[PDB]
Amino acid sequence: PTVEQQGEMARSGGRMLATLEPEQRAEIIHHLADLLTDQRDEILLANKKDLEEAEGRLAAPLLKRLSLSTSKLNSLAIGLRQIAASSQDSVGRVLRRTRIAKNLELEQVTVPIGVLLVIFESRPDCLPQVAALAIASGNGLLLKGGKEAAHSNRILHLLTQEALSIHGVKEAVQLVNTREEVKMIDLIIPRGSSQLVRDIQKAAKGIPVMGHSEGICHMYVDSEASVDKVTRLVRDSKCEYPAACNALETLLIHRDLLRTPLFDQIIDMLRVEQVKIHAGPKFASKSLRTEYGDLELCIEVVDNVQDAIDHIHKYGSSHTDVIVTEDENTAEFFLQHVDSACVFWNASTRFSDGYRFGLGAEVGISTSRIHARGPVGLEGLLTTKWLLRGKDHVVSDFSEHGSLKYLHENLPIPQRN
Amino acid sequence: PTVEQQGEMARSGGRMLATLEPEQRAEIIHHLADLLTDQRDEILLANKKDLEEAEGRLAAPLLKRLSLSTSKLNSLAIGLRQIAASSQDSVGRVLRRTRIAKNLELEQVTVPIGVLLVIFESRPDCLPQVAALAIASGNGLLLKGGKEAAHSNRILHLLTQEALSIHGVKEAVQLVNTREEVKMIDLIIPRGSSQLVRDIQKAAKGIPVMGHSEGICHMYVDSEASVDKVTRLVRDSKCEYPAACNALETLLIHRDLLRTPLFDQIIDMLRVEQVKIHAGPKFASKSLRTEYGDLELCIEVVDNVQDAIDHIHKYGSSHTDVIVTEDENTAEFFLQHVDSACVFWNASTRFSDGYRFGLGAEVGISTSRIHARGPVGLEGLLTTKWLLRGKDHVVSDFSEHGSLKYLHENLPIPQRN
């Protein structure tokens, strides 16, 4: 089919998904989760083909994101079941209910955004995440993956369509031919390099784009930091996965620690991990807005929490920023005043992830201050609609000399759990 | 002060507002509401000056929006008290609470967007609305009004600052000198013409812009429409305020009504109201995407509800669209399938307004499908932050061969009312 026909099928499949009972959407997602487990061997075989075709040729950033492990598949399956189990009140949820006037009733409800386009390079593991999240939110979906992940994406899409078939909604998730280049789509979600993400931002006039182009993440080691905690926190944030959007890029160190064994153990762990430190200005006594995405790290000296906060605001990407301290007051101050999507106390920067956060999965991480901030789960794939049911109501009747009065009585709404 | 200094004061005043107790923000808003009433005579005197300076000179669209009536001031005061009374759990509200793992706790909370810039032409009545909504959501605010409303805006700003002074947060609401032309601002909210709204959309690289550039609104008269209801609904939607963004632009008529007294009474009321009808194609047997903003109206014939829905989707601005019918099934079908921000049954198009909807006020009406849809109240002025409090937690510990397991236990959260 043509990409325009895929758009139309995703839209009609999306609309059918939204009219299913919540339990039926959950059923599709449970089935997909089972298929990830049951079909692991074939999944891994197709991923092996991708890896072998990529070996020696695909750029290291893309290559690292290409592999699918038995472990990863196991967490996907766990995450998809969490979505299935938690998503039942999601679509058509009543947000507001107001009696505007006698016989004039308003409600505000959640509805799907419509049709999503996810454009991802490498990352076959995001296919099941975004498909399950779209399914759970009643959305249609077009998937545009790269050549490098063709075998993996192909099988993962097949399985998704097998899961959808149980309620006759295969059309809801379309795989776009790698042939195609970058009114139909309501939202674009790019998953890849800053260049791809900014290229997409540029070519998308009209359509909103959801994500982040950068991950300049900080960790502030406070004067009251536990010597028993700092090293492993810095090591994990920087070294567990240097290429990650939430990898540590700038280590901010309280001044009271420069002549301390705590500071020594840090430099010791950084040299054991073969990490290139670049000294910030104060510290010495290139750029503080750099994402290394490798075994490199900025270390700068600060005077106090306020200084750390100021630095994070000035140089950071508002993605993930962390304080290490034993002082609760100081920690809570930092958590309150750092304006990042994700602010942590005594936990690694690497925790910002939909699955880790108990969302089951993410479509991506957003650093926007509009719509959806941080890892975006199913709720960031919904918008709203205002419904007004009247008798014969006109605004003139409510004017100064009119016959009618407003009541504006908010009515009770079902609690969530 | 310079506009950069105003930015900094709004930001610091915003941050102080957010750290106040909810009851103190409510107190500021209650005081402002009282001042609108107590100072009505001076407000009206300043507005009279604006009107007299505008008389014969200001463009009719801007002029119509320039007047402040004793009535309008009364509804502002009522709307501001509704905000004060309903806004107490708004800022810092817990959205999600999850025990990620033993001693690793996550919460997602609401926080202010930061600093808002509202750019409005004419409309002095929006000043108190946007100021009260910003105050209630913990935001800083810069107001950029036009020369035509200088006296009104001046007094309304003065009073706002008097209200803020009770908790020492005058700086939170800045009035930008009409001198200035179109890192500091987190959101722009334009209130004016499609040209201004699109000029702003264009000049704002970086900053999100919230609103609508168009109001092509439809009303579908179903075959099962009550003859006793249609005429007054069409008359109000079109004639009560033709220049309104939510004024009726296209009347869609079910075919089963062409040879009916119901149809006759419509044309009769349209001629009494001296309204220029332009026949759609089918009907006859210029453009269907036109906003007249005057006593002009498109009438097109349709075959059924599906046809009406298709037409609304094709030609409409997804703002406000209405069905007139006595058949509940048909009405609910329309309400479900029309993708507009606001869909009504047997109520005038003119009801889409923050005050009318029980929001107390609006910052504007949004036709976006991201962030905030329809009239935007205080809740569209909030974003979120993820807080993670750990012990010494690292992601490696949770890996396949690690020591730690996730719990992902959602914890109970306080209900709202």
From Swiss-Prot, chains A, B:
One GO cellular component this record assigns the protein to is: mitochondrial inner membrane
- Mainly localized where? mitochondrion
Q: What is the lineage of its organism?
A: Eukaryota, Metazoa, Chordata, Craniata, Vertebrata
Keyword Amino-acid biosynthesis appears in the UniProt entry: yes
In the record, which positions carry N6-succinyllysine?
183
Q: What is this protein called?
A: Delta-1-pyrroline-5-carboxylate synthase
**What are the recorded GO MF terms, alphabetically?**
ATP binding; glutamate 5-kinase activity; glutamate-5-semialdehyde dehydrogenase activity; identical protein binding; RNA binding
Region (Gamma-glutamyl phosphate reductase) residue ranges read 2-417
Origin organism of this chain? Homo sapiens (Human)
> What disorder is listed for this protein?
Cutis laxa, autosomal recessive, 3A: A syndrome characterized by facial dysmorphism with a progeroid appearance, large and late-closing fontanel, cutis laxa, joint hyperlaxity, athetoid movements and hyperreflexia, pre- and postnatal growth retardation, intellectual deficit, developmental delay, and ophthalmologic abnormalities. Cutis laxa, autosomal dominant, 3: A form of cutis laxa, a connective tissue disorder characterized by loose, hyperextensible skin with decreased resilience and elasticity leading to a premature aged appearance. Face, hands, feet, joints, and torso may be differentially affected. Additional variable clinical features are gastrointestinal diverticula, hernia, and genital prolapse. Rare manifestations are pulmonary artery stenosis, aortic aneurysm, bronchiectasis, and emphysema.
Q: Which gene encodes it?
A: ALDH18A1
